[PDB]
Subunit: 280 residues, 7 copies
């Protein structure tokens, strides 16, 4: 367009930039004021966030949630400072909040799971359905809980494993607790031959469970016929013992059951099979 | 830019701060008024929440929902106080509500599952499909319910387990109740040899179930041939008894069935097999 | 700041509170008017909700949906009541509606599933794919429906078990009705030895079902060779009978099949397999 | 506050209500006119909904979608009436529209599945991938379709079952149509001994399938060795027949195969095992 | 209220309707003009939708998307028509746009999957990963594709089945194409006795695959020992052939393998089993 | 209404249309201007989209993402053009943007999956975890990658199969790469009789793996007893070789292992069984 | 319409374009100013994003999150510039922000998961549940972690595999760490004959584990009878050793157990089976 796209417009057109010097000075002053407002807002936001966190901690509020609200307050104040600065810039204060809301929505979509994990961790720590050192199962993975972080928990399996579970999945599934009740129940299933004397087996098992000191005598001690298996008669034995002695009692009772069953002549049956013959 | 970025602008420029002292005093007064508004709003919010909770508790409303809505009222009032305080400050009253809405959306995304669990727990307590001490199954985990908390239920398995289930998953799945009906039905599957006399087996089982005092005689007592198994004829026996006697009746009936079947000469068959010889 | 933070500002500054007496009186009048508006709105909302529920119930509308929409009307009217009250207070009427909007969104985040269950209950009660008293299957659980509550369905398993299913899950999955069609079909699979005479077996099975009075002769009665099993020839028998006689007909036909097969010399084959011998 | 909360403000203060008699009359007139507007809006909404449904039914539009959108227009008109009435009362129409939007959002969250089922039912009826009377499978459940309702389909399994499937789930999964194609293919798997003559077996099967009049001779008829099984040589036989004769042809061909193989000396092999002996 | 609810207000109060006749005439004129505007908008929307559809179809655009966005334009234009008409009625257009938005949101929640099905159909038709007559697998169901409709795809299984699959699910899962490559590979697993000569078996299989004309000699033809099975040595044979000859080559090669293995004395082993005697 | 619905209103009422000729001309001019604006906006949108696509392609931006932003810019510009045109028509510019927003929301609900697939494809191209010609597994389906299109990826399975997978699914699941490392590990499980000499077996396996030139001697070569099986002692052999020689090394080592095990007298055991005899 | 659609309107109508020359010049000036604003905004956005990233990197902020926030600021500033330019051209500044919000919503739906992957990757690096070179399990896939990229992780399975896992799935599932604890536990299951001497077996196993120097003697070393198997007495042996020696200890202990069990005469039992003879 002849001279419209040349020095008549670029390089300030010689005198066009000079004639607009006052406008440039005003814009520079506005930008400087906006930057100063930004700096002041950041400083006051950090100060007020620290102050409110300290105040909340004093009022018996948990550290994690107090930090969460302190960070939320800090983010709100810095967003307010950005609103004020861009209003001083003159961007209608509406597109500014729209852009900030879009950015916050993107950040929320990014976090979602992490924030849910944080909330679940807060709930876990304040209800404490399980605590450090307590043996519990967490939805298919069982072990001793070491500690509960803000986003995840660390638990040690009996074999020395280290397992980290996000806190969000913890509250969604079941919380299988092994070490809450001081007393728990063992269950033995014993297979005997079909010709074995039921009364003798019951009496022997009753003697075995009677001779154990770690079995709670004041609770139920079930020794009864359970079901007629395909190749073996199955007896069910249920006894109660302290959670600490649960495993040892199981092994001791099983070893004894084996020993007296061998001595008494009661036979543990191999898989029975019945064969009929024809010639061809 | 020469002297624009030096003491001519920083350190109050000597007299610029002196001239702006009036505006600084006005802003300080505004900030003090806003802080006083925040304090009085927090105090009145706490008082109003306590008052409304106390009032509605008397109106036969459940404690959990009353506390929840009292907390909602308190949060609403503190948000309103923040709106008023920042309007006094001059943060356009629209960016403030937008940022508060974004924070509330983040908090809602955080809670989601937990707050749904709270709603579910409210539903369970007043409908009471199950209650403390009642033996129920909650989708693969069965035990005695101990208590129904606001977010979760603690239930004890028959073996001494302590099970914690979030309330939200409870209502989503089936509620399998064992102890609501005072009378329940047992089922026995008895395998006998193919050459066994059907009439004799049926008559013996009928005698066995006739002599049991804990079996309800006024209800159906089926002793019928069920299906021709691969290696055994299977009879089905169904009897009804009070829920407290179910297991004892099952065990006693099975043990008797074994005794009279042994005495009558009816044989429980091992896995049957027919073998044909070929020489190679 | 010298005396700015002392009695010159606190305790009403002596005369500052006195000079502000008119504004405090005006604010007290505003608060009293707002509270009176709240009370009037609550009472009128309750009256209007009761009136509309009573009116629409008479117009052949279901009780559950009528109660739901009456509660919705009551909540709406109290929402307008709070809007008007806080406008009287002077809370800009926009932050107010934003606050109740966030509260309603949180309430929805509570509901989802339970409100869906209520809607599903409405659909079930109005379409009645099943009705109380009949035997149905609702996605893996079978039993007799006892009643259909507004949130859940109570059904009794054939063994006396009490089963509670949320209404929402029922409509999402299949609804199998065992008792809708008055006539149903049994299916027998009979395994016979490979050397058995096919014509004799078919003729005997035809005789057995011909003499059953509870089998519908006007419908198809298939007795045909179904498949050549690994160890047995399998015959399929399909007969139709009234739903009330299905199990009894099944049991009687099976017992007869066994009796005449024993008499006719037709042998039910045990698991067949032949062995080739080598010495090593 | 002395006499602020006494007869001086309650019970119309003697003359305060009288001085406000004109304002009370104006409010009463406003309420009466608002109720009249509501009644007029309701009646005109009903008239317009009926008129539009009648008009669109004539224009070859399906009844279900026409009724749905007529109800939508009815709800829109009553919503407009509520807006007009509540705004003319002076509620600013903004809280009014927000409350109605929240109620509509709650209703939509409640429906969701039901409305999706209605849309799916419309799609199924207008595309008719299956039609009432034909035998089809809908994702694991097979039977004859009885009818397609607006919300769900009733379908009868071959054994007399009555199964109701929500329309939404139907369109999400596969629609397996057993009866669309008039001709279908049977498949036989025949196990014969390893020493059996392959040519003789193939020739016998070819004779068997050649003599069947219901087998389409113009289509492929494969009789070929399929795979060398663990204990048997497996032949695959594939023939085509009209969908009405599919089952009968299967049974007839299987029975003829058994009869000819018995006569021809070809042996169906029992499960094979090879045994090596050692003494210990 | 004395005479407030009598002929003094109902039945037009005699002269009140006479006085308001002018307003009634104005309202009637407004309603008539609004209805005329609705009619004009509807007809012009239909015309514009048809015109834009035709013009864009002329511009090499697919018919499905053309009809879709033409319907979108029609719905948009009728939406503007409703906005204009209801604004001329005096409904402020804000409640109008909110109600129409709520209706559109409900319609979208209804459609959702169906509209996704249309988009998936468009993607499949324009990318054509498969086409009519091409034998493919779409996630567990395999067959010859017949046609691809806008919402669902119809395909015929090899046995005469008719399969209808929504387009949305097809694109979400794997699309396994069976006939895109003109050449494909067969795999044979041959079990032989442990004492069989490996070199003889390998040489015989090599001759068998050498004597087949339909096996591509220019591609890999592996005949190697694959793994030492429990009872049999398993050889793997992999050959390549044209997709049209894949099945026939498999059957021919298997039948030959059987014939020359019988001729050469190489034995296909039955499940070998080892037995030790002890007397008891 | 007498003559209100007749020629006095229709057919322009004779002179009513004539008296409004200027207004009709103004409306026609407005419509013509709006259509011209639409045409100009479409042309300029296409031009600017082409220009920006070319510029981004020149600025080392990937072709797919450049095309995506070009299409986004074109759609945005045509949206602004429609806004301006309907503002010229006079449709309040707010209902217009609401209608376009609803249309865009519907289009987004339609695409959703496709747009996610496009983004996943862009990520897959730019990080290239796999590349054309490289053999990988992508969640249960393995084969050689042919190409990665914008919406989906194509793969050839080792048997010549054709698989097309959406890109969105690829990034969601694991990307299992077979051909990244130049060296990979084989694993042999060898079952031997319980009486076999462990030292002899280990020495023979070591001799076998030493003589293989394609086995990397600089890496670990594990030959150790792994576990005591039910019927066989299982040795584990792990060797490393270049990815190109993996299968050939496996086959050669297995065949040798068989040969020297036969030569040395070490026996591969058949399934062992212990039988105890009793007479009945 | 006569001459309305001809040169009187097109080609600038001769003088109509000339009369509007000033308006065209003003529009061209506005467009040039808008383009200059766009260029300046892009330049300043790039400069600010480069500066802020460098600024926060110095403040001990992670590189990934710093780059993410820098990109967010750049996109925000370019959006602000677009708002300013489209305000200058005169598009009401409202439809502009609506279109940009729709585009951002589409982009968010596109990335959605990928952005969540970036957030998960940021979470992983700071808490480092696993680190490069550390052998861990990622929910069904186990291997040595090579590196943690921003969207995915590369991990090498023990057999030379290359495994790529999206970061999002990592944080959602369990994280099992095999190499965090320096000491881990072994578990041996040893099956012995029923007649074997329990004390002898226990003493021999204890002697085996006492003689291993790599087994931690200060931790539990359980050698107890575990359960009575179908055909074998099963002993459980649990020992603890350093993670580096786990597999070697396992192999050595197993080989010894075999050797001294062979020497001591203790027999590993083959699958026992019980056979009863009958003649037919």
């Amino acid at each position: 367009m002849e001279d419209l796209n040349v020095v008549d417009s670029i390089n300030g057109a010689g005198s066009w930039l000079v004639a607009n010097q006052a406008l440039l000075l005003s814009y520079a002053v506005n930008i400087v004021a906006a930057l100063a407002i930004i700096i002041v807002g950041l400083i006051i936001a950090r100060m007020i966030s620290n102050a409110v966190n300290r105040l909340m901690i004093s009022r018996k509020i948990d550290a994690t949630v107090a930090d969460f609200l302190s960070a939320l307050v800090r983010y709100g104040i810095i967003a307010f400072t950005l609103i004020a600065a861009l209003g001083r810039v003159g961007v209608q204060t509406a597109s500014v909040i729209a852009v900030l809301g879009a950015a916050g929505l993107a950040v929320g979509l990014a976090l979602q799971g992490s924030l849910s994990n944080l909330a679940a961790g807060v709930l876990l720590v304040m209800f404490r359905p399980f605590r450090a050192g307590e043996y519990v199962d967490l939805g298919g993975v069982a072990g001793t809980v070491l500690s509960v972080q803000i986003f995840s928990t660390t638990m040690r399996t009996a074999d020395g494993k280290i397992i980290v579970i996000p806190n969000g999945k913890i509250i969604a599934g079941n919380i299988i607790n092994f070490s809450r009740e001081p007393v728990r129940r063992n269950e033995f299933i014993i297979g005997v031959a079909y010709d074995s004397d039921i009364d003798q087996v019951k009496q022997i098992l009753t003697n075995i469970i009677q001779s154990e000191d770690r079995i709670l005598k004041d609770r139920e001690m079930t020794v009864r016929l359970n079901e007629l298996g395909a190749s073996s008669i199955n007896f069910v034995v249920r006894v109660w013992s302290n959670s600490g002695d649960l495993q040892n009692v199981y092994w001791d009772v099983l070893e004894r059951i084996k020993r007296e069953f061998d001595a008494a002549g009661i036979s543990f049956p191999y898989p029975q099979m019945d064969v009929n013959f024809k010639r061809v």
